[PDB]
Amino acid sequence: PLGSMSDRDVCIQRLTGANQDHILTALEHGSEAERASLTAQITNELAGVDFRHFNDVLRESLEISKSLAEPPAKDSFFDISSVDRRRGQAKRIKNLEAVGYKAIQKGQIAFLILAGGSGTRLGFDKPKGFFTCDGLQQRKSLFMMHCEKIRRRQEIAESISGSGRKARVQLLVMTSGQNDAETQRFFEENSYFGLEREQVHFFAQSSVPCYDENTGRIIMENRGRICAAPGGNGAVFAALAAPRATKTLQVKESLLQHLRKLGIAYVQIGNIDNLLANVADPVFIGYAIEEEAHVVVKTCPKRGPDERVGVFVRASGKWGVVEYTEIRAKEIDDATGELKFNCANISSNLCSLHFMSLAAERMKSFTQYHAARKKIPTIKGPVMGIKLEAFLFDLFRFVDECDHPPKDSGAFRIMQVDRDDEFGPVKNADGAASDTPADAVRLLLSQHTRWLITALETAAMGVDVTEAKEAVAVMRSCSIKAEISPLVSVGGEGLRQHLPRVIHQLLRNPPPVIFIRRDDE
């Protein structure tokens, strides 16, 4: 009713009565340039952040960081974590896959890419989605390969349905305030990697302030900038809640509300760093649908007892993750010889839109964040401060509140998957001990190699039976690998048509890595 307010006046309103008066002072009485940069930061990088609420978050999170957990019951979750476990369950997997494809066709699926991180650790000062792995004949960014996986899954859904309608997965790209513009530019310059512009939604997350432990004051990086840090993937809820321009222009609604109007039923969430990400996975989707789950998490067996990864647990009937620093944890089940706590968190989730909505509502009053003491660089020298994080898993305790009444068997499910098929995070520069681009590329090639050997062996049972058999023998004894474009195959399908060329190469002059791509690439 009082009309439009300047960005600065909105910031002033947001900081009034927030117990952070040193910031309010900077906004009201700082230099022109200081007032402006602080305004831009609080507006564009901390949009929606409730500063009073975060004082409570700091207080509680500090208290918490100063034994009820039980593992998932043996044999209680869907386990497809090896070749042998998948063989024994082949029909169930195929049936779930068909359910997932129907949902993709129906336009019910969104994929949310966590895209706030940079490639700085990889030696690349651009958003991580821009990163191009060496060692691949495809010269494609991580963003490009994600989009091609969506295109392929959409194409398969259409082939199964026979529908006249296009299968469309909504792509939600969760940027940072600082990297949003450059991310949109990259997509635009590349024609959205073959996607429709209308199915791609860019939305910026908010960072979280850092605090002095003794006083609870927000730390200043400099006179024009508060100390703030990426909040962790729990930022999704606030980010999906932010009002956006809405169409005839109407009152602003959230991306969440926009998705509900588009008929989205599930949101699959994953980090852009995962080279092996099974994007729009129809088995994951089919499992959620058939289980009537509001949350499904993907997990992997631990690599060994000392792997520094969080594991899923249930405590007092509530599901969550216990991080390696907080862990009985390394006990072995007597019968199987497997760790009792053996569902490692690979940050790959599928959530109902109802859950996304309810979790966001609950999170506004939620104060149990993860606090860490960190040395923080500032223009006045380093200081010790508190950083606060929250993760998707912190909200899973609310999952059964989505049903009235809750289901007897609950609405949370675990899907234990094969790590080497599903999880290859690109996090550390080549030459590091783990999670390097080369490590992820090795897993990718190993997976494609398995798919091609399988396709060749099926043909061994149009190409000549004996030539296919000979070609497989060449693959094995020469240790030939394959690299397969997602536009060709996302799960091992679609290779039959390529076998004449593959077989010719294998029998005449095999390269170290057979490259399979669409003719029009």
Ligand X SMILES: Cc1ccc2c(c1Br)[C@@](O)(CC(=O)c1ccc3c(c1)OCO3)C(=O)N2
For binding to ligand X (CB under 6 A), which residues are involved? 48-50, 53, 206, 208, 231-232, 234-235, 237-238, 241, 360, 363-364, 389-390
DSSP output for 159-206: HHH--SSPP-PEEEEEE-TTTHHHHHHHHHHTGGGGS-GGGEEEEE--
- Cα first-last separation, the chain: 55
List phi, psi (to 5°) of 369: -85, 170
Q: How many CB atoms lie within 10 A of CB 440?
A: 23
Q: Shortest Cβ distance from residue 398 to ligand X (Å)?
A: 12
User: Which residue lies nearer to ligand X by CB, 312 or 369?
Assistant: 369
Q: Alpha-carbon distance 251 to 20, whole Å?
A: 32
Residue number, nearest CB to ligand X: 231
Q: To the nearest whole angstrom, how small is the minimum distance from the Cβ of residue 223 to ligand X?
A: 24
Q: Is the dihedral of CA 388, 390, 394, 399 positive or negative?
A: positive
Angle between helices 21-29 and 32-44 (to 10 degrees): 130
* Residue closer to ligand X (CB basis): 53 or 121: 53
Among 188, 174, 184, 168, CA closest to 242? 174
Rounded least distance, CB 395 to ligand X, Å? 9
Give the span between the Cα atoms of 50 and 394, in whole angstroms.
Answer: 19
| Residues near 46 by beta carbon (within 8 Å), at least 6 away in sequence | 177, 206, 207, 209, 226, 228
State the Cα–Cα distance between residues 199 and 205, nearest whole angstrom: 19
Residue nearer to ligand X on the CB measure, 130 or 369: 369
C-beta of 116 vs 425, nearer to ligand X: 116
What's the closest the beta carbon of residue 17 comes to ligand X, in angstroms? 15
User: Closest distance between ligand X and the C-beta of residue 258, in Å?
Assistant: 15
CA 124 to CA 384: how far, in whole Å? 28
DSSP letters spanning 64-81? HT---EEPPPTT-SEEE-
Instruction: State the minimum distance, in angstroms, from the CB of residue 182 to ligand X.
Output: 21
| Complex with ligand X: residue 55 or 416, whichever CB lies closer | 55
Q: Which two tokens stand for residue 490?
A: 């996302």
Read off the DSSP letter of residue 411.
S
Q: How big is the chain, counted in residues?
A: 521
Instruction: Report how far residue 495's alpha carbon sits from residue 489's, in angstroms, rounded to the nearest whole number.
Output: 7
Q: Which is nearer to ligand X, 238 or 353 (CB)?
A: 238
Closest approach, Cβ 47 to ligand X, in A, equals 8
CB of 315 to ligand X, least distance (A): 21
Shortest distance, position 268 Cβ to ligand X, whole Å: 19
Neighbours of 361 (CB within 10 A): 14
CB of 37 to ligand X, least distance (A): 20
C-beta closer to ligand X: residue 238 or 265: 238
Task: Rank residues 14 and 102 by Cβ distance to ligand X and give the closer one.
Answer: 14
- Give the position of tokens 């068909």: 98
The number of angstroms, rounded, from the C-alpha of 192 to the middle of its chain's C-alpha atoms is 19
362 vs 450 by CB, closer to ligand X: 362
429: left (phi over 0), alpha (psi -120 to 50) or beta: beta
Smallest gap from Cβ 61 to ligand X, in A, equals: 11
| Minimal distance, residue 51 CB to ligand X, in Å | 8
228 versus 296: smaller Cβ distance to ligand X: 228
Residue 281 Cα to chain centre, angstroms: 13
Closer residue to ligand X in complex, CB, 363/441? 363
141/207 with CB nearer ligand X: 207
**93-117 burial by CB neighbour count: b if 16+ within 10 A, else e?**
beebbebbbbbbbbbbbbbbbbbbb
